[PDB]
């Protein structure tokens, strides 16, 4: 059986889909990790916390060592109102004074 | 030391302004950051007594690293329902948006250091590309001494409809995304 | 910065070269004198009102906060005018070197 | 780490090592950073750029002692580190129109 490919063009499958670009959005997220907060819920012993802090620091140093810093032109995240509330609550939520 | 991205940038203010009819292609940013706590993202830290808890944290933390080394976003710290409701997109649109998303780390800082308690902060910059035209079924053209030349390089066939697509200035990700596509007879 | 050769190619008029950018401007190459564009000089254009020129719609940008830039201010120099060499371009059309 | 916990730890760490070696990357938990930094006398940024762009290779895995209770394995690893001479961070690409 002989067939003539019309018009001088042949075609093969291409599994990769195609996407047409539109407005490209970007957002910034600041993630804060505190060992004390997770320690309180776990009812965790003193020596076990001494182990947990070192376990966290090893991974944090490993992550921070293999990446260099860049500059996002958004601005300073300090002045954000939500960040202020979150930062006060992370550490100073449950402290009181009695006279 | 520290690199930089230079040039003034346009900003969308509130997040639901991405879908309009008066803005064109470009890089758009949000005015305010998103503050996230690891202890608030995990829904099962409690009800895990003894040593088990630390293991959980370790595992999850390890997973995060296995993400950030590959320039990919871990969505355990980003609720899908919130973004889906803000963008008002379809399920397939959400899938294609999340699949082809890349991340970047621009500062890791240690605030409180001690023999028992430690605290860390991580900055993450994302980039999401919303679609305008998605093509699933497509065929690639080969030409087989007369050699007639052609403008179209991809062809589409779906719903008994045939289209001819030409591509230019195209970047490659897990999928194929590109900006200049014009239908040519 | 340039000792660097030159080679050109002629094209069948007319041609419209419009390149959008990612900050709210446009690149226009004028092969004719139409709309509002000086002839025979490529340029970058930013519009004020939403118009439709050269078979492409235009949209105005939005106010952006000024920031310090690291732009590469480029030097300046001219080229050779005589048209006789350009006749060779009409002969073949393949980009052929003309010394500079 | 008493009881069964210990084996879990090993498993996790071992799994991590595999997730490294499949991607031709170096896991530095078995290579002290302070030793290499002191031997090379480089800066922190130089250390970061050196470690980021480092590749590894496995050239022999051997099983020496085999039994129903005790086992021992040996792994050979070949690394390649590229020290820098000139690093350029801010740069622009040229298009001709
Ligand atoms: C951590 O400790 C707290 C309090 O010590 C536990 O909270 C109580 O747990 C007991 C059971 O041990 C329950 O009967 C109570 O209803 C809980 N609440 C209060 C207010 O007493 C908590 O369960 C412990 N977490 C663990 C063991 O994982
Ligand atoms: C978008 O970018 C263009 C290109 O830079 C800006 O136009 C001018 O470009 C020259 C050199 O590139 C600069 O020296 C000028 O300062 C730029 N103009 C201004 C007003 O700063 C253009 O301004 C940018 N912004 C838009 C179009 O909104
Ligand atoms: C494993 O066993 C050894 C010895 O059986 C433990 O070492 C002793 O552990 C006890 C507590 O069980 C301590 O009071 C001693 O000071 C330890 N040393 C000596 C020389 O007796 C070791 O702690 C055990 N490891 C565990 C349980 O993880
Ligand atoms: C292909 O060849 C077979 C014989 O093996 C024949 O029966 C069939 O009709 C042919 N198909 C065509 C000519 O389209």
TrEMBL record, chain C:
Compartments it resides in: Host endoplasmic reticulum membrane; Virion membrane
Source species, domain of life: Viruses
Cystine bridges: 2-4, 35-53
Subunit structure: The mature envelope protein consists of a trimer of SU-TM heterodimers. The N-terminus of leader peptide specifically interacts with Gag protein. This specific interaction between Gag protein and Env glycoprotein may allow particle egress.
Function: The leader peptide is a component of released, infectious virions and is required for particle budding.
Protein name in the entry: Envelope glycoprotein gp130
Species lineage: Viruses, Riboviria, Pararnavirae, Artverviricota, Revtraviricetes
């Amino acid at each position: 059986n002989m067939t003539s490919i019309p018009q001088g063009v042949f075609y093969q499958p291409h599994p990769e889909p195609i996407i047409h670009t539109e407005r490209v959005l970007g957002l910034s997220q600041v993630l804060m990790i505190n060992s004390e907060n997770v320690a309180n819920s776990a009812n965790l012993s003193q020596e076990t916390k001494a182990l947990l802090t070192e376990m966290v620091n090893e991974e944090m140093q490993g992550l921070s060592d293999v990446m260099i810093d860049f500059e996002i032109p958004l601005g300073d995240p300090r002045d954000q109102e939500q960040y202020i509330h979150r930062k006060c609550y992370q550490e100073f939520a449950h402290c009181y004074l009695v006279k | 030391m520290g690199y930089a991205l230079t040039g003034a940038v346009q900003t969308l203010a509130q997040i639901s302004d991405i879908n309009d009819q008066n803005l064109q292609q470009g890089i758009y940013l949000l005015r305010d950051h998103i503050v996230t706590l690891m202890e608030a993202t995990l829904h099962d830290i409690s009800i895990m007594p003894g040593m088990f808890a630390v293991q959980h944290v370790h595992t999850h933390l390890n997973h995060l690293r296995t993400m950030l080394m590959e320039r990919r976003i871990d969505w355990t710290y980003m609720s899908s329902s919130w973004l889906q409701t803000q963008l008002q997109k379809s399920d397939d649109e959400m899938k294609v948006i999340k699949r082809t998303a890349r991340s970047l780390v621009y500062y890791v800082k240690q605030t409180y250091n001690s023999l028992t308690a430690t605290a860390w902060e991580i900055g993450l910059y994302y980039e999401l590309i919303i679609p305008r035209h998605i093509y699933l079924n497509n065929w690639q053209i080969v030409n087989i001494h007369v050699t007639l030349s052609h403008p179209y390089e991809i062809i589409n066939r779906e719903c008994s409809n045939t289209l001819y697509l030409h591509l230019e200035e195209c970047r490659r990700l897990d999928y194929v995304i590109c900006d200049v596509v014009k239908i040519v007879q | 910065p340039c000792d660097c050769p030159v080679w050109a190619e002629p094209v069948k008029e007319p041609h419209v070269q419009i390149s959008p950018l990612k900050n709210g401007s446009y690149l226009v190459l004028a092969s004719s004198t139409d709309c509002q564009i000086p002839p025979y000089v490529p340029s970058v254009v930013t519009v004020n009102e939403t118009t439709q020129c050269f078979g492409v719609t235009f949209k105005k940008p939005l106010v952006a906060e000024e920031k310090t830039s690291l732009e590469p201010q480029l030097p300046h120099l001219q080229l050779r005018l005589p048209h006789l060499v350009g006749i060779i371009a009409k002969i073949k059309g393949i980009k052929i070197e003309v010394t500079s």
